[model samples]
Target: QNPMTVAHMWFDNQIHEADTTENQSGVSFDKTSATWFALSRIAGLCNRAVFQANQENLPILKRAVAGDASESALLKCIEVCCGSVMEMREKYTKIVEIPFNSTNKYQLSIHKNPNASEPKHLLVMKGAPERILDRCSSILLHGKEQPLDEELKDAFQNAYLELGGLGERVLGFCHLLLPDEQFPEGFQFDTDEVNFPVDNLCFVGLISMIDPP
Candidate 1:
């Protein structure tokens, strides 16, 4: 099955409308809090990571589909992609755990109210995994690694691209969730193109193609 398709399904199942009395710390995120927006951002990051991992293996996938690649080769590519995806998932999980595990860890700062007599504290999520992935991608693509092996080089490049795409999508989703005034000025979600309509049949078709009877 395509990893991205599976990921989309998982994300759809995980999302829910915030209900009343579901307050975090002192903030109530009744489907319209900044914290809820951050959660959506995190979800987008997680979903995009899987999608990007599958995209990274597209070259090998094409070769396999055309009968020009062996099962072993395809399996190796899948393993490498899966490993990369696992790392991303672990990091995202850690970030998500912070809100529930330590409710008081997050604090939202209001720029609009500079002179409020008392400071206003709201539930805010921290440690965006997308930023970490961005730095990792930059290092992998630009770091001095001369004479790197052909296969490893391809792996590094693919992983970098995957992280970039994931980070881009995270930012896009964040913007969408934020209120018009709270969203960044001139920031647009046009660059990252994530396909929302995924067909589960694509996974079945891929399995049949790879393991012909």
Candidate 2:
């Protein structure tokens, strides 16, 4: 005798409505605010985790974030981490914005004309992990090891904000993509061991398929 099994998955198709808004095309104050709010929360958690891990697990985290000879093995964990984040965005119908190909570009832009002009890009996010990764890569591997200059640090910090900004931009897009579904309400981070307000953060943005432009 043979047995049969059944499985089910449910999704709110209405959520798709939120991804269709025009505000995402430019700057939307509300969208920006929401983006920053979420990004900040994520950043605080990651920073704390990284800093704490630095003392004990830096080598492991480093190998995961930056690739290594064993990166192929760790790829599953990275994909899971990144995929979880993407699922959150999908739930909210928010679309994070990053350069088409640039991994660490903190600037956000809009073209006056998509075809006529080069997009008017502005540096929005500074001083975040992407920037840190950019700096770390240059130093840890590329041999430019002088400490980051104050200006460079400032720029990096600004880039950090964009990490948050990307979330906000995604939210703006969600307003159109999932118009019928309200964004999940903000939740408070509750941990008795440490207490901190959420900080602005941006998603590292989508991983690129091609080399940095």
Candidate 3:
């Protein structure tokens, strides 16, 4: 596709389907960390973000379109919400990746730490806000956890419906900072059948998107 075609599609997406409803009382992370998280853990592993043409790269969605549509436009849509791609690689080490399916309703990627002076694995999970919410016992705000009570749950649920009801695709993100002891040297992390480490996660908040035609 030419620049004009991609430009038109992107413009149409932004002009028509770009706004997402805000939450009244839910966890919201600072933009830097969220984008960093999204970039380092997800986009860093994506191949579609790579295709360079004439020293310029096509958007991840465009690359997916011309090559293989495995990554899906949702990746591009969510990605467009935050901006970053290059810094996460050196900060995080990618390990296990779990595919999203109809049953699971989410996807998981386990990444090892950067400079904690030891091996600490951080599990980044994204999927349906409700499903992720079920696993989260706490929410991260001001860099600490606050118990996610029923009212908070209801508050988030309210926002979830408001966003989804608008036809916006709402996704929740959570981070699991795995225990250093349990995942010690030569740890046996069976990606085939995932268990906890996903359990009792800290909810990071939601990102809603629909910027595609």
The Cα local distance difference test for each model comes to 0.24, 0.24, 0.50
Tens-digit per-residue lDDT, 1-213, candidate 2 = 221110110011101112212355323323323332222222221110111122342332342232212112223223333433323323232122333234343322111111211121111222223432342311110211233345544444443344233421211100001111232223221222212212222222221111111
Better of 2 and 3 by lDDT: 3
| Candidate 3 C-alpha lDDT tens digits along 1-213 | 322111111111111122232445324423334423422343333323333332325444444334323233434454454634344544676667666653665677676776643247777666655777889887654444568888677767666665443432455656657777776665457575555456767665544433343
Candidate order, TM-score descending: 3, 2, 1
Error of 1 at 211 (Å): 26
Task: Please give the range of 10 consecutive residues that has the lowest summed lDDT in model 3.
Answer: 4-13
**TM-score, per-candidate, Cα-based:** 0.16, 0.19, 0.60
Q: What does each candidate score in C-alpha RMSD? A: 21.1, 22.5, 8.3
Against the true structure, candidate 2 reaches a TM-score of 0.19
Instruction: List residue ranges in candidate 1 displaced over 4 A.
Output: 1-44, 48-83, 94-171, 175-213
lDDT of 2 at 96: 26
- How much is 167 displaced in model 1, in angstroms? 23
TM-score of 3: 0.60
Candidate 1 residue lDDT tens string, 1-213: 332111111111122222222254234323323333223223222221122233452453332332111112223333443433334333332211222132232211111112222122111122222332222211111212123244533443343344343322212111112233544343332213312111110000011012111
Order candidates by lDDT, high to low: 3, 1, 2
